[PDB]
Amino acid sequence: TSIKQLTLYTAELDRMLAFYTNMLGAQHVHEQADAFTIQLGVSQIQFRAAADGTKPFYHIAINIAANHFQEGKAWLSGFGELLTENDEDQAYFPFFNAYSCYVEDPSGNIIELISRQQAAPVLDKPFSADQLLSIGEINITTSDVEQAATRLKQAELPVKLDQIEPAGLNFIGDQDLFLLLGPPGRRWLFSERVAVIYPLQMELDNGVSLAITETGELVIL
């Protein structure tokens, strides 16, 4: 399955709109009075205003083609300084057989491009914003990992309940989409920001819709 729409919150709506309009182009962005949407291939994200006194952020990875990693990295670097971890400005993840690079948006969202070496197409054409494929990762930061995992499984996502670590990060998915399910508390790779519960909503292309509430409960809508 793929993410059809994600709804995220931001304390920086105006700066975010400018950032994504410049990055993706006006044809991939729609402004509303109280929100805006961006198109990432087959996935959409709506950003809405955060509650005053909060500064929500998320870990968002965007799938790019198997052969587009270095072009994607160069492109991404035009929009901010590439984030580094251990003084490296890219990463290889053997579990996903994937290369990743990262930049921060105006809210501190971790914007990752992920090039899955066997789980993405080879596209024989130049990379551009038009070649972003879909959302490949989103964090599901929850106050109850076991409950969340159980509800995701009841919703017919691939979940091996006996392997779930309630105090750790759990990769839930297959192919080109993984939910990063875990508790708050720990610093995110490539970021200064520590995992904190912020609300979101997610609609999958198979019709499944869910929310993370402001207290971190995963609820099936």
Side-chain angles (χ1 to χ4, degrees), residues 1-14 16-221:
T1 200
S2 67
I3 293 170
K4 182 174 189 298
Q5 197 189 58
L6 186 56
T7 300
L8 304 179
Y9 294 86
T10 176
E12 297 290 347
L13 269 176
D14 290 328
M16 289 276 282
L17 175 68
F19 177 85
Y20 287 103
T21 298
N22 180 66
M23 171 187 279
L24 302 179
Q27 72 278 13
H28 295 310
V29 184
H30 183 266
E31 176 177 4
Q32 307 158 250
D34 62 346
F36 71 93
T37 59
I38 64 174
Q39 193 70 32
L40 303 171
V42 300
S43 304
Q44 186 186 74
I45 300 183
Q46 183 182 68
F47 288 104
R48 304 187 66 78
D52 286 354
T54 73
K55 293 182 183 296
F57 80 105
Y58 310 84
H59 168 107
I60 309 162
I62 303 163
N63 284 313
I64 63 176
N67 61 309
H68 278 172
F69 184 71
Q70 289 297 327
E71 289 178 71
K73 183 182 181 187
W75 174 81
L76 198 71
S77 78
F79 303 105
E81 191 65 29
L82 294 178
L83 299 175
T84 65
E85 181 73 31
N86 201 29
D87 300 325
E88 307 280 7
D89 67 359
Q90 65 176 61
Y92 175 73
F93 295 97
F95 182 71
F96 297 116
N97 186 20
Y99 290 92
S100 301
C101 60
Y102 304 79
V103 72
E104 202 166 47
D105 78 7
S107 302
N109 294 313
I110 303 164
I111 306 305
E112 175 186 346
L113 301 184
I114 184 169
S115 178
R116 306 174 189 278
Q117 294 301 290
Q118 295 198 284
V122 168
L123 300 179
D124 185 14
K125 66 173 154 184
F127 178 84
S128 76
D130 301 332
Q131 307 309 324
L132 300 175
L133 301 174
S134 59
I135 294 165
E137 296 183 342
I138 182 65
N139 63 295
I140 303 299
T141 306
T142 178
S143 51
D144 192 332
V145 166
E146 181 172 357
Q147 177 190 61
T150 300
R151 291 179 178 173
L152 290 168
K153 188 182 179 63
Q154 290 170 346
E156 295 189 343
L157 281 68
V159 178
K160 302 183 181 182
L161 286 174
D162 60 275
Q163 293 175 0
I164 294 292
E165 300 299 332
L169 194 62
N170 299 268
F171 296 136
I172 294 184
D174 192 21
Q175 300 189 115
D176 64 2
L177 173 59
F178 291 82
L179 311 179
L180 274 42
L181 174 72
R186 182 181 294 175
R187 186 183 71 83
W188 281 100
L189 211 72
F190 284 86
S191 182
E192 290 188 48
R193 299 202 63 169
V194 309
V196 167
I197 292 159
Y198 293 112
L200 63 70
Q201 274 181 90
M202 180 175 71
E203 179 186 353
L204 302 181
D205 69 341
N206 69 2
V208 171
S209 183
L210 58 92
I212 293 287
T213 71
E214 78 292 341
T215 61
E217 184 185 0
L218 185 160
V219 303
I220 302 301
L221 308 178

